[PDB]
Design an enzyme around this catalytic site. Structure first.
Site, short mmCIF file in Angstrom:
data_model
loop_
_atom_site.label_atom_id
_atom_site.label_comp_id
_atom_site.label_asym_id
_atom_site.label_seq_id
_atom_site.Cartn_x
_atom_site.Cartn_y
_atom_site.Cartn_z
N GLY A 27 0.82 -1.20 0.00
CA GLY A 27 0.00 0.00 0.00
C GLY A 27 0.86 1.25 0.00
O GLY A 27 2.06 1.21 0.29
N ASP A 160 -0.22 2.08 14.95
CA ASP A 160 -0.59 3.35 14.31
C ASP A 160 -1.00 4.42 15.33
O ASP A 160 -2.08 5.02 15.25
CB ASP A 160 -1.68 3.13 13.25
CG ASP A 160 -1.11 2.78 11.87
OD1 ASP A 160 0.12 2.77 11.70
OD2 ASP A 160 -1.91 2.54 10.94
O1 LIG Z 1 2.49 1.79 13.92
C1 LIG Z 1 3.21 2.48 13.21
N1 LIG Z 1 3.68 3.80 13.52
O2 LIG Z 1 3.16 4.31 14.65
O3 LIG Z 1 3.68 2.08 12.00
C2 LIG Z 1 3.27 0.78 11.57
C3 LIG Z 1 4.38 0.18 10.73
C4 LIG Z 1 5.65 0.17 11.29
C5 LIG Z 1 6.72 -0.37 10.58
C6 LIG Z 1 6.51 -0.91 9.32
C7 LIG Z 1 5.24 -0.91 8.76
C8 LIG Z 1 4.17 -0.37 9.47
MG LIG Z 2 -4.00 2.93 10.39
#
Ligand SMILES: O=C(NO)OCc1ccccc1
Ligand SMILES: [Mg+2]
Ligand SMILES: [Cl-]
Ligand SMILES: [Cl-]
Ligand SMILES: [Cl-]
Ligand SMILES: [Cl-]
Ligand SMILES: [Cl-]
Length: 344
Positions: A27, A160
């Protein structure tokens, strides 16, 4: 320093250590799935987009890296690696982050019949992770089903974290980006605190029990009306606490409504689930149950273990009130990349 190799994937150059193989776009930062030959995990690799383009963006890059480096808990995302192809601060321009490859709760909620036992285990894990996050004086701010990852064995991780990046247009209209937000921050009533996350957990738990969004408002005002119909209009004690006279003025224009009977809203649910929802979905944020208190509620009796619900190391957020130049945020970020120590 490992050896790096380059490739172009959907109009973006990716330069990564040899350990990461079979990159496949997932994505658009942009994210790719890969195989990690060092750990043997399938991983997600995120390349940040323009991480140092402005003071706001440079501070946001530092904020995300500091948060991810701190989190060491079973029910929270963990950082497997962070890297840059740059060989010095002078050529530093790109940041890559790596974690275990994740389904979200949106998929299982819409596609599956969940027993009460499933709801118990899923909400227990959210609260176990939240107790850890809140013990470091971190507020997530953006809990919702798409930010909860779930595997085949019903094990759950929070990810996230809110980086204070969501805009007003992202929150406009009939959108899931707003349906899980506490009323006091949806309209910027007050200086909010960690209790806003408990409101979001109540909204998620209701949706797991009924299969339906609890407050699917068509805009900010429609959503507030749905909320107040369930939990009642505020009393004078809560109105005092609303700093903006403009928002106080609008609230008082609404006809008064009493709190509804939750056993007649959540027909057929476990009475202990109804009791917990009544303690989470309280309008006055001072009076909501905390994550630590909720773990001890009888609804979680078959999972609760107070010797296996750990708290976090302290987290220094003094940088948040600091004013620095772009190159100074960039140098702080570089220091944190090169000092990263991988987990065992
Ligand atoms: O959770 C978060 N940031 O707060 O990123 C998710 C993420 C972290 C590392 C690699 C892909 C997706
Ligand atoms: Mg999200
Ligand atoms: Cl390598
Ligand atoms: Cl670079
Ligand atoms: Cl969502
Ligand atoms: Cl009235
Ligand atoms: Cl710290």
């Amino acid at each position: 320093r490992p050896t790096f190799y380059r490739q172009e994937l959907n109009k973006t150059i990716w330069e990564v250590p040899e350990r990461y193989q079979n990159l496949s776009p997932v994505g658009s930062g942009s994210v790719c799935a890969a195989f990690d030959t060092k750990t043997g995990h399938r991983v997600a690799v995120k390349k940040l987009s323009r991480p140092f383009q402005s003071i706001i963006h440079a501070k946001r890059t530092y904020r995300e890296l500091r948060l991810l480096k701190h989190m060491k808990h079973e029910n929270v995302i963990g950082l497997l690696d962070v890297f840059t192809p740059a060989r010095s601060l002078e050529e530093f321009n790109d940041v890559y982050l790596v974690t275990h490859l994740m389904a979200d709760l949106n998929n299982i909620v819409k596609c599956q019949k969940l027993t009460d036992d499933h709801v118990q285990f899923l909400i227990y894990q959210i609260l176990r992770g939240l107790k850890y996050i809140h013990s470091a004086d971190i507020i997530h701010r953006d809990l919702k089903p798409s930010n909860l990852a779930v595997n085949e064995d019903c094990e759950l991780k929070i990810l996230d974290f809110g980086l204070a990046r969501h805009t007003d247009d992202e929150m406009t209209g009939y959108v899931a980006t707003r349906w899980y937000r506490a009323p006091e921050i949806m309209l910027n009533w007050m200086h909010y605190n960690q209790t806003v996350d408990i409101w979001s957990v109540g909204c998620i738990m209701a949706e797991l029990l009924t299969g339906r969004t609890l407050f699917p408002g068509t805009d900010h005002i429609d959503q507030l009306k749905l909320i107040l119909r369930l939990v009642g209009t505020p009393g004078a004690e809560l109105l005092k606490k609303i700093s903006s006279e403009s928002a106080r003025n609008y609230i008082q224009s609404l006809a008064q409504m009493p709190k509804m009977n939750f056993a007649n809203v959540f027909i057929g649910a476990n009475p202990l689930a109804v009791d917990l929802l009544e303690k989470m979905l309280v309008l006055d944020s001072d009076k909501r149950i905390t994550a630590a208190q909720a773990l001890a509620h009888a609804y979680f009796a078959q999972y609760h273990d107070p010797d296996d619900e750990p708290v976090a190391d302290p987290y220094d957020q003094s940088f948040e009130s600091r004013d620095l130049l772009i190159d100074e945020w960039k140098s702080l970020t570089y220091d944190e990349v090169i000092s990263f120590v991988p987990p065992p």
